[PDB]
């Protein structure tokens, strides 16, 4: 889901 991509971007900026 394209809609999920920015959630992962957000997550990998955290860690």
């Amino acid at each position, epitope marked *: *889901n*394209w*809609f*999920d*991509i*920015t*959630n992962w*971007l*957000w997550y990998i*900026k955290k860690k």
Partner: antibody
Amino acid sequence: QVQLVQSGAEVKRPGSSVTVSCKASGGSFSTYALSWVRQAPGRGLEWMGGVIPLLTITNYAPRFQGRITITADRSTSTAYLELNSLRPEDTAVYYCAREGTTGWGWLGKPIGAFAHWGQGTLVTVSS
Amino acid sequence: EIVLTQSPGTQSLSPGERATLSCRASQSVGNNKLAWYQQRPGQAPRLLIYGASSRPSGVADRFSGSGSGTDFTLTISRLEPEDFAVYYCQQYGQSLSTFGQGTKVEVKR
């Protein structure tokens, strides 16, 4: 606070191409999804497609695939919708919309749903 | 493609009445990725509910969303004068996002 400001109304000839712009301020431009939604006069909302600027990844609704281009310019925080081969049925108000975020501020976890809307751009296809 | 059905397309209700608006999906909506928007004439849509039941800050708590899978409901506990407007559901559980056709809540007299 996130603010989306669109270019002004435009009259376009049948068969021509229109470019609509959406300039964003506040929040993050590159890491949140920006979509375009249109509304023909007296009709409902229709999602057309979107872009994630950091990754230059677009996502088009099948019924517009081959007739639209969405692009993003990080230097100006501006997104663009191109719609080609215009017909009278393309007369509509075109909205840009950016997904919301959770928590305080505007740099939180994205929510997918469209919290932030431009003011709309009326595109009238006419001779 | 997920087709969202909002029926009826119009509801005539009295000020102060409770409103329940249905949104039914042609197939299960992934991760309850279902939103509701309000739109008044001449204005841009406004987000009321996301993720089926989550309410952004600033949105009045008389608006509540419920449901899962294919069956979703927007409830307005008590209609204020500004609540007479058009309401859209939207699913974003697939890369192809779609809207319902909208339900106009108008004043019964």
